[PDB]
Structure formats: C-alpha cells, structure tokens
Design a protein around this ligand. Structure first.
Ligand code: HEM
Length: 386
C-alpha cells in the first residue's frame, strides 16, 4: 500500500516514478515501512512543506545519518541540520566565502579538468563513465576550492569515496587534516575556501573553527555524490533519447537546458528530510508531531499538475520551478557550482566524443532511494583530442 511503501523493493530502485505517481494519485501523504517516515509527493504540497520551516524542521536530517558511527561532538552540525534563527546567521557567514563570484571564476579550471578527464579516454572505444568522469570531476573541483595540498589529494579522494569503521577513520582524518590547514591559513591565508571562511565577518560575528571545518565537510557530502549523479543521470537520459543527444551534440548551446531537464526528470536528490514540530495537516492528511517527513523532490518534479507529460524527457520543455535544489531558506548553496560542472563536463564530452551509446540498455542504479545515480555506466564512444 501507499501506507506500506518499501523503498528496498527492486521495482522502486529501478523506477521510483511508478510509486510516486501512484502516491500522488492516492494520497497527499504516504508512509515508508519499516522506517515509518512520511512521504509527500504532490508538487504544491512539497513546496508548502519546504516553505514551512517553522512546522517542518531541518533537524529531520539527523534521521539520515549512519547509525553505529561515533561523531566528534565538538563538531557543530551541518548547516543543513540547522533551523532559524541560527541557520540564517550561519548561512550569511558561509556564503561570504562560498560565493557566486568564486564559483563563476572556477569555469576555466573546470574546463581544463573536463578536458583532462576526456584525455584519459583517448584510444579507448569503451569507458566506464562513473569512475573515469563523473565521480572525479566534483571531487577534484572541491579539493582545489578547499586548497588541498597536492600530496593530500589521494587521501581526499579516499575520504570523499568513504563519505558517498572505515567511515569513522576517514571523518577523523578529514578533520585532522583540515584543522592543520585552518591553523596554517590563519598564519598565511591564500585564495582558498578555508582562508575565505576564516576571513568572513558579518555584524562583527565570525564562524567558529568547528563551524569552518563542519562547512568544509558539508561541501564534500552535499556536493560530490549529487553532482556526480547529475552528470551520470544526464548521460543516461541523453543515451535513452538519441535524437536529443544528437541535437545537443550539434548545438552545444542546448547544454544548460539539458542540465535543467535532467535536474527535473532524474532529480539527483530524490528526497530530503524534515521533522514535524507539531501536529500538522497537508492535503487533509494529518501528520503527527515528531514525524520524519520526506518531501519527495523527484515526485514533485514529475507531477503532471506542474510539468505536463512529466514522464517525457524533453530538453526543450519549460523546466522553471523544478525543486531539484530545494526551495526557500535551505536552497542549495552549491546550485551554481553543480550547474557549472555539469554544463562544462557535458560540453566537453559532447564536443569530443562521437556517437555515444550505453553498453547495456539496463542501467544499474545505485541501491539508494535518496540519491538517484548509476552504480556504473559503461559507455561506447570514440574520443577526438581536445
Ligand atoms: C546536482 C547537484 C546537487 C543537488 C541536486 C543538490 C540538492 C540540494 C538540496 C535539495 C538542498 C536543500 C536541502 C534541504 O532543504 O534540506 C541542498 C542544500 C545544500 N547543498 Fe546542494 N545539491 C547539489 C550540489 C551541491 C554542491 C556542488 C554543493 C557544494 C559544493 C552543495 C552544497 C549544499 C549545501 C551547503 C546545502 C545546504 C544549504 C542550507 O542548509 O542552507 N550542493 N542541495
């Protein structure tokens, strides 16, 4: 039933949109079993939830955290777990460092990274797109933004891979290293994000050291797997829609639109987390106080109410108002960076690769309801040099 949703079901992992459509048709609210989490599927309702920060707290994100893992309790929580009024203070501080200006200025380096990744494909007629392209790009870009020393880049990869007993070690090593980095940049700042986070000051208030480190950590967790997902999902959508791929390969100015339609069609973050603070009502369904609630961004983005023929992938549709990056106060800080990495990587892939096909018609999706991404994506294509 819609009151007995099993996210482990192979059909749900394969095609969650069938469940989502059934939920939207049936009820404003669904229930996951055995987690007991409440799911909200209709576009208007998802938007209402995200705009209602007083009724739907971000402390719900605590429900997503891996059990059996010891957290350094001197580390403040991720910004994504914080509610007003603390949230606004923190967000205004971190976005003095992680700014649209700093993201836009990365584009030349991002293009170079894209070209180097495609250089690794030369002389091959098949490649595995995740390991060779979509997984490295976000991780390389964020390590450069954070000022990671060249000799610590492989440790950073390992930490990144582990965050997608081992997990505890990687988290401890991440913070040990960035603590050291933070003290070095207090002495001699550079142009990197740690330096800029340390400098930030608003109304004579500054981030604590814990807050700097916690935000650094958030950027890996928040940014890597989701951006990887966007690029892989784009490759899946384009290979499923040959004529659209063909169109974009002939006109690279389409790529921003491709990216927006993948964001809507195969939303990387399929849902997010909230917790009700009171008894609340959505679409005449009451949700008890203290329930974990999953606003189903992916369901909202495929809601016929908002997006006509929503199961049609159409790079020429109007994508305005999709909720892939959320909405309102917690709207993705990384949204310009994700959009830029994806545009640049797809511009380079599309320009340099000839005919692109999947090896397999079947996509092996990662076994996550929460993040929609290919576990592997073997592709057939020929490279043309940069
Ligand atoms: C396609 C890629 C991405 C998607 C789909 C995505 C999606 C989202 C969503 C849905 C939220 C809102 C969470 C909420 O309301 O609880 C969010 C928040 C956030 N994302 Fe992203 N994101 C992506 C990439 C990035 C990247 C590249 C970064 C940074 C490098 C990043 C950093 C953040 C941060 C810091 C927040 C928290 C903002 C806050 O709580 O105020 N994200 N993301």
């Amino acid at each position: 039933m819609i009151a007995d949703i099993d996210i482990t079901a192979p059909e749900v992992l394969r095609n969650p949109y069938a469940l989502f459509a059934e939920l939207r048709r049936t009820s404003a609210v669904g229930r996951l079993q055995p987690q007991g989490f409440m799911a909200v599927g209709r576009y208007q309702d998802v938007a209402r939830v995200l705009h209602d920060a007083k009724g739907f707290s971000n402390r719900g994100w605590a429900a997503s955290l891996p059990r059996g893992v010891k957290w350094d309790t001197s580390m403040p929580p991720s910004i994504v777990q914080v509610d007003p009024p603390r949230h606004g203070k923190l967000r205004t501080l971190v976005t003095k460092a992680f700014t649209p200006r700093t993201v836009a200025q990365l584009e030349p380096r991002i293009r170079d990274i894209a070209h180097e990744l495609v250089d690794g494909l030369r002389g091959k007629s098949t490649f595995e797109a995740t390991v060779e392209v979509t997984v490295p790009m976000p991780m390389i870009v964020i390590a450069e933004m954070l000022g990671v020393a060249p000799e610590r880049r492989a440790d950073f990869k390992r930490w990144s891979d582990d965050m997608v007993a081992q997990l505890e070690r990687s988290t401890q090593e991440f913070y040990a290293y960035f603590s050291e980095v933070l003290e070095e940049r207090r002495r001699e700042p550079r142009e990197d994000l740690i330096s800029q986070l340390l400098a930030a000051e608003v109304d004579g208030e500054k981030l604590t050291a814990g807050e700097v480190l916690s935000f650094a950590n958030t950027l890996l967790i928040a940014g890597n797997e989701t951006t990887t997902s966007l690029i892989g999902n784009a490759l899946v959508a384009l290979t499923d829609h040959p004529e659209q791929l063909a169109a974009a390969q002939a006109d690279l100015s389409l790529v921003p639109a491709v990216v927006e339609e993948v964001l809507r069609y195969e939303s990387p973050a399929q849902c997010i987390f909230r917790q009700t603070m009171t008894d609340v009502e959505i679409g005449d369904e009451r949700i008890p106080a203290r329930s974990v609630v999953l606003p189903l961004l992916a369901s909202a983005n495929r809601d016929e109410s908002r997006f006509p023929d929503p199961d049609r992938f159409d790079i020429h549709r109007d994508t305005k108002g999709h909720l892939a990056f959320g909405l309102d106060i917690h709207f993705c800080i990384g949204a310009p960076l994700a959009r830029l990495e994806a545009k640049v990587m797809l511009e380079v892939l599309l320009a340099r690769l000839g005919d692109i096909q999947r090896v397999s018609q079947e996509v092996s999706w990662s076994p996550s309801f929460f993040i929609r991404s290919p576990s592997t994506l073997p592709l057939r294509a020929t490279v043309a040099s940069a």
